[PDB]
Each structure stands twice: as structure tokens, then as C-alpha cells.
Symmetry: none
Subunit: 201 residues, 2 copies
């Protein structure tokens, strides 16, 4: 059983909430001890240095929420834009503090593919843990944002495939952690019927 | 030597002290939760240790993103559901680790109002900075999710439905007048374009 990961994540979350919102000096101390217990548990059961765990798992301030991943959905002539890491994914990544969702989509498409995009559409919000589960210290929500190409040009790569458009019947090897087969299928379903229901987990 | 047992016992003791001595409803709730979780953990067979998951942090870089707030948008008789703290807001709040966006919406409606909801609809994601910034440096994305009362019981100062022309004094930090007007626009037009900052 690896149910304990969930438990320890819960304890850290509640301790972090207490550290953020408690106004009682003694209860703040109690929440600090609880956070430290959660780090100790995580450190022992992942055989990871305590200070490394503190940094990666228990150094956020404010209430602990899921993290935000952005994926840009860019179509051209019924084909969808993917970028190769050797597995493939839609342009995107973590939402950077200080950027709006569309600003992240724009930046990532430009940086990863060379294209300039605009005319944003909210397409889906998927729960990463529901769709592409993996033992994880965190929780991620994935915002899928449709974009129109208005400028730039596709990056080229010598002797390799790195940035390409793919049709629904010729999908490359997917990075499932970043996009599942059915998440991609849903984007093609949107392309075929743009007025359809926009999915939320 | 099965280490989880003693750590859980430590959590139990701290939680019990906290719930015994606190006079703040929100702290009491936090400690109550920790008590309940530790009871559950202790109910497992004591003679077996947890499975080690090495490299759980292999790809983890401690990358921070904006925080996520959820607001449930619930209409009955063309009126919109609000909760009074004395300013008013849609049911909602911070999204929790372990829950999907609609699970958070349903949990917050349930906890604040007693109502059971279903039939979720994605409406908007706003950047808190473009609508209701404060001197606070906390970056927040706000997901607005429509849903429908299907059961529960009406069960905090006040829980009330309000029409578009009788909106109460809003908690602007949680929902601006413009955000609320957009929600009324979704009610009137089910195919209104989803808003995203």
C-alpha cells in the first residue's frame, strides 16, 4: 500500500493552513510541529534528505492548493501541435507566478514552437491525478487553452523531429504525464464541434 | 522498527491538545481533521510498515505556481446563491490537494450551505490580479463553476439567494460586481463564451 502518501500530504496541507491562518501563538507552534512531523514522515518513507523534503514539499507560504499546469491547444488544418522532449506533448508547463493563464499559453507556444498566438479559448480543466495518476508529493490542475496562430514560424531541427503538427490518426508517442490519449481525443472532439461542452473534473 | 506508528501518535497528541485549548472555530476544525486522520491511520495493522517510495522527489523542483480558488455558481429561480461571513460571497474557497475542481465546488457548497450539488459546468477562470488585487503578493487563479442543487438541506451568519438587481454587499476580494454580472450573463445565455484571463 502507498495510501500513506495521501495521508502525509493531508497532514502537511492542514499544518500549512494553520501556519497561514492561526492567530494563536501556541497553536502556531502546534502547526509548526505538525508540518515538521509531516516532513519527517515523507523524508523517511521516500529515503530523501530531510532538508530536501522541506524545500520541495513544505516551503510554500499561504494556503496549500494544487499546482497549475497549462497546455496550449493549437490546430492547423485538422492537425494538432506537439513538441518532443523522446515523448511528445502539447506546448505548455507550469503557470508562472505573475502571468495570467493566457499569458503562460502564449509564452510557452512561442518559446517551444516559434509561433505567436492569440484569440484564446478556455477548453478544459483536467485533474492530473484523476487522468494520469502517479505517486506524487503534489496535486495538479491542467488548464487546456485553445489558441490561434497569428505570427511567427515553426521551429526547425536538424536531423531530428522536435516540433510538428499531427492528425488524430497519426498521433506520436505521448508523454502521458503531460497529456493522456483521451485528453488529446477530447481536443480533437472540440476541433470537430467547437460549440460542445467544455470539460471540467 | 516501523516508524509511522510513533509519528501518528505524536500527531494525535498535538491535535488533541489543540482541539482542547483552542477557542477559534477554524483552528478547532483543523485539529479536529488531524484527530480524525490520525484515528484512521492508527486503525491499520500495527505489525506492518509502509512501503518506501524512493525518488518520489526525483523530478520535483519545488516549482511554485499561482494558488487556486474555486467559486460555485448556483442559480435557483433566477437568483444566485451567496453566503455571509458581514460581506457576501459565492460558496467556495481554496482548492485542496486531493480534490478535483468540481469536488471542491461541491464540498464548499455542502459545508457552507448544506445543499448537495451536481451537473457542473465550467464558466470562467479569472486572474485575481486583473479584477480584485490587494497589497498582498499572493497570485491566485479563480475558477468559476456552475452547478445545480439536487438535494441536501439548507443548513455562518446567513445563506441567501439574490436576484441581479438586489445584490448584497459583496466581498470584493472573493468576487467583484463585474464577475457577478458575468455569472448572470451565463445564466441568461448557456452558450456564452467561457471567460479566461
Amino acid at each position: 500500500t502507498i495510501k500513506w502518501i495521501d495521508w502525509v500530504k493531508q497532514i502537511q496541507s492542514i499544518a500549512q493552513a494553520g501556519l497561514t491562518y492561526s492567530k494563536d501563538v501556541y497553536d502556531i507552534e502546534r502547526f509548526q510541529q505538525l508540518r515538521d512531523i509531516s516532513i519527517s514522515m515523507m523524508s523517511h518513507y521516500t529515503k530523501t534528505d530531510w532538508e530536501v523534503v522541506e524545500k520541495l514539499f513544505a516551503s510554500e507560504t499561504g494556503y496549500q492548493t494544487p499546482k497549475v499546469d497549462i497546455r496550449a491547444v493549437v490546430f492547423q488544418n485538422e492537425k494538432l501541435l506537439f513538441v518532443k522532449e523522446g515523448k511528445w506533448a502539447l506546448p505548455g508547463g507550469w503557470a508562472d507566478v505573475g502571468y495570467t493563464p493566457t499569458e503562460v499559453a502564449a509564452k510557452e507556444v512561442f518559446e517551444e514552437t516559434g509561433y505567436e498566438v492569440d484569440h484564446f479559448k478556455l477548453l478544459a480543466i483536467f485533474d492530473k491525478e484523476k487522468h494520469q495518476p502517479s505517486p506524487s508529493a503534489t496535486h495538479v490542475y491542467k488548464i487546456f487553452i485553445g489558441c490561434e496562430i497569428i505570427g511567427g514560424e515553426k521551429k526547425t531541427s536538424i536531423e531530428t523531429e522536435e516540433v510538428e503538427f499531427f492528425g488524430e490518426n497519426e498521433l506520436p508517442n505521448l508523454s502521458i504525464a503531460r497529456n493522456t490519449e483521451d485528453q488529446i481525443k477530447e481536443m480533437f472532439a472540440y476541433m470537430k464541434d467547437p460549440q460542445k461542452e467544455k470539460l471540467i473534473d
